[PDB]
Ligand SMILES: *Cc1c(COP(=O)(O)O)cnc(C)c1O
């Protein structure tokens with residue numbers, strides 16, 4: 001299909017990454033994933049905003065305005081005739097002779113972006129999934145959506161080997177997030193989730209789900225919960241741009257409550273469904 | 278110039294990295310840097326061994342024997358007529374459609390290697406450098422020389438901005454290592470350096486310096502020291518394939534002893550010299 005290469009939409013074949021692109025040698029870059037439903041981009045602005053925020057935290061300066069970027073993403077979805085799926089895009093510090101310190105301000109960041117046709121995970125949304133506790137060994141700057149995802153691939157891989165869908169990370173007892181999702185816990189009608197600090201990424205879906213909770217008048221407490229507490233919850237679920245509201249009905253062979261999708265998860269899913277095109 | 282691409286040496290212009298190379302999207306890979314002196318590859322075997330160890334730690338299987346790899350690096354040095362500089366080579370899990378977990382056991386890892394003429398840091402070895410303490414916020418698997426280097430890029434850049442040579446990282450007072458070097462201290466004729474565990478990277482130059490100390494009968498104590506104990510040390514220096522034994526005469530405006538390169542650092546350099554081609 002077509003790829004966004006900086007400010008140009010070109011055939012996939014024409015794209016060539018330099019061996020000295022700082023993203024390829026240092027993972028010196030940031031990314032975003034945007035869900036597309038029936039040809040319409042979902043919360044594009046929230047995501048573009050975060051891309052620039054991520055880039056700013058590590059001092060990268062995107063050469064285009066949010067509007068141009070918005071235009072490019074819109075044109076990318078048109079060229080590829082994307083119906084239902086997602087868009088992936090990243091920005092790196094640019095191609096420059098290997099060195100740790102930041103290059104010269106002459107170096108222009110490299111923007112790559114492509115689309116992928118991918119249906120909604122219906123069975124999962126409906127039936128729920130198995131998860132597994134995996135120790136959080138990532139760096140202390142999880143608030144940046146960077147390309148340094150080695151700790152996350154290892155965790156997701158451990159989960160996959162154990163036949164689980166996601167890995168619920170924890171920095172010594174305290175639950176933080178999934179290898180690629182935010183974690184929610186419902187107990188006695190109340191929604192709990194780790195507060196957005198440096199120990200987790202403030203998910204867009206996480207924020208939309210907290211919004212939905214306010215609309216249906218469900219009390220939200222942004223307080224950390226331990227691994228033991230997580231197992232004693234009534235309902236449990238993870239969120240991400242592609243997973244949406246995915247129920248977690250089991251953790252390490254232990255059924256959450258009774259192993260069925262809870263009442264409030266269902267309610268929150270229904271409220272979320274209204275914000276979709 | 279010329280570049281090692283898998284098991285071939287080609288013109289730089291012939292190499293093309295895919296956008297979906299896991300080293301570009303996850304920093305999912307490992308690398309090494311070998312110093313070349315007058316056409317001869319210094320401690321090339323120790324470095325080849327570590328590349329394989331590192332790759333094994335994250336379950337990447339390099340398709341060639343270390344023997345075949347040694348050969349290729351040898352042809353790369355000749356093809357580029359490299360006299361004194363270094364070789365940079367890395368291995369990534371390979372190109373596969375984006376996903377966190379490992380691809381099918383059919384995706385061949387991508388290997389890239391190149392050279393660069395770069396003289397020895399004579400002035401630094403002779404006069405010493407200025408450094409600055411920086412909090413270590415890197416992940417917990419520092420024994421792996423992986424491509425996830427955003428934490429070291431930020432620290433080195435901080436050191437650079439403060440007008441310093443290197444950043445000496447520390448996890449709550451305990452000095453671990455540099456952003457791209459190992460740290461050693463000397464107090465009362467005894468050599469101190471942090472133990473080789475998951476907190477630091479067991480450098481080759483570090484091991485050679487330990488051997489030099491044994492050869493010259495200097496006692497070695499592999500125990501951690503604090504940022505305070507570091508400032509009270511008689512001598513200080515950092516090591517790396519490209520820095521060799523670079524003395525540190527000042528940390529954040531605080532002089533080490535009297536701000537001059539010391540006795541034992543000189544002895545160690547002299548001994549290390551007897552190993553250079
Ligand atoms: C991307 C990501 C998420 C989900 O954020 P969304 O914007 O909701 O997709 C959650 N956790 C981590 C660690 C992530 O990298």
Ligand SMILES: *Cc1c(COP(=O)(O)O)cnc(C)c1O
Nearest residue numbers: 457458459478480481482517518
């Ligand atoms: C590469 C590296 C070193 C030095 O290793 P050498 O084999 O001596 O070059 C030291 N510290 C870190 C953090 C490194 O990445």
